[PDB]
Amino acid sequence: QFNPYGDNGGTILGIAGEDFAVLAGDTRNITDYSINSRYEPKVFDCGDNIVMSANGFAADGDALVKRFKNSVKWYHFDHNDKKLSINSAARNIQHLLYGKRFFPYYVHTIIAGLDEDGKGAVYSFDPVGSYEREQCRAGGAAASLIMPFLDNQVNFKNQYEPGTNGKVKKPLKYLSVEEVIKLVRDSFTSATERHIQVGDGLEILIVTKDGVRKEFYELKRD
């Protein structure tokens, strides 16, 4: 019997800062125990200061990104070159996903950018289109390895102030872009050590008011 779905591995991570947002992902593509590519880009600049990644089954992932990029193009045509805001993009992606409710895109989608007040924004989607604005979201193979670490080091969960013994929480102080990138790199380095589908390389797309910047880092190739 023909199986229309597959699993290409991969792990992605989106974090929203005070006036910035990062969307990171490993560059390794796999089937079963084989490596297809050590560098296959998975996070994409979609225009209008929006970055996107659709992780899981790569064929569906490429199809969805392609259709969203197309949606941005036609939004400009139909609405006098108006900038597609991150919240409007998110609602639009819900409809692209739910349109195939009974034959779904087998992917976990994350988009990142800035909201209309210039503050960092990340949105997260399930395969059939349910979505949420979030501060912090890992997706894909090693999501379960990364999220608990982020709860602890970004949101300071289970951390209290010394001397008070559980009475006063550690205050939630804002993180810089340099600080966030450190946590992203350590997240993927740790995931690479313990998950066989994570490795080769890490590509990070950073979004500010100035635009979209890229950073690349080597990961272990075993």
Partner 1 sequence: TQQPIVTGTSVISMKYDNGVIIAADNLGSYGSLLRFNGVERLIPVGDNTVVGISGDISDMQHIERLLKDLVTENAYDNPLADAEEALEPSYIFEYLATVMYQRRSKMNPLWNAIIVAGVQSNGDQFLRYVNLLGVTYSSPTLATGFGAHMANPLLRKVVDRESDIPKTTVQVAEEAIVNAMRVLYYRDARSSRNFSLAIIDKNTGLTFKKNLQVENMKWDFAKDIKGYGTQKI
Partner 2 sequence: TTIVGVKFNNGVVIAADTRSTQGPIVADKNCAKLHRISPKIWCAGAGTAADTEAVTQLIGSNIELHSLYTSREPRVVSALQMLKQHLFKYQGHIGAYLIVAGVDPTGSHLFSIDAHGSTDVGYYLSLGSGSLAAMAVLESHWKQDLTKEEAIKLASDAIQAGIWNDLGSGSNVDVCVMEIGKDAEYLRNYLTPNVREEKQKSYKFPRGTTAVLKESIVNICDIQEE
Partner 3 sequence: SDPSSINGGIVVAMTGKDCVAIACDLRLGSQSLGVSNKFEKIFHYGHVFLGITGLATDVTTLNEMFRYKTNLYKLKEERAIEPETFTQLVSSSLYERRFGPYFVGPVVAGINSKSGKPFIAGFDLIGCIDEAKDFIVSGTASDQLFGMCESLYEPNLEPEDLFETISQALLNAADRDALSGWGAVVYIIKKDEVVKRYLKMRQD
Give residues in contact with partner 3 (CB under 8 A).
Answer: 142, 144-149, 151-152, 157-159, 166, 186-187, 190-191, 193-194
Kindly state whether residue 119 participates in binding partner 2, applying the rule CB under 8 A: no
Question: How is residue 170 written in tokens?
Answer: 């550690």
Alpha helices in 116-162 (DSSP H): 143-153
Query: CA 76, 80, 85 angle in degrees (round to 5)?
Result: 55
CB 207 within 8 A of CB 21: yes
Please give the Cα distance from 161 to 149 (Å, whole number): 19
Question: How is residue 44 written in tokens?
Answer: 């994409």
- Which residue is associated with the tokens 């379960």? 144
Q: Which is nearer to partner 3, 170 or 213 (CB)?
A: 170
Which of the choices partner 3, Mg ion, partner 1, none does residue 63 contact, using the CB cut-off of 5 to 8 A by kind?
A: partner 1
Kindly state whether residue 81 participates in binding Mg ion, applying the rule CB under 5 A: no
Which of the choices Mg ion, partner 3, partner 1, none does residue 4 contact, using the CB cut-off of 5 to 8 A by kind?
A: partner 1
Kindly state whether residue 204 participates in binding partner 1, applying the rule CB under 8 A: no
Residues 44-63 that bind partner 1 (CB under 8 A): 57-59, 62-63
Residue 93: burial class (beta carbons within 10 Å; 0-12, 13-18, 19+):
buried
| Chain residues that interact with partner 2, rule: CB under 8 A | 30, 33-35, 141, 153, 158-166, 170, 181-183, 185-186, 189, 193-197, 220-222
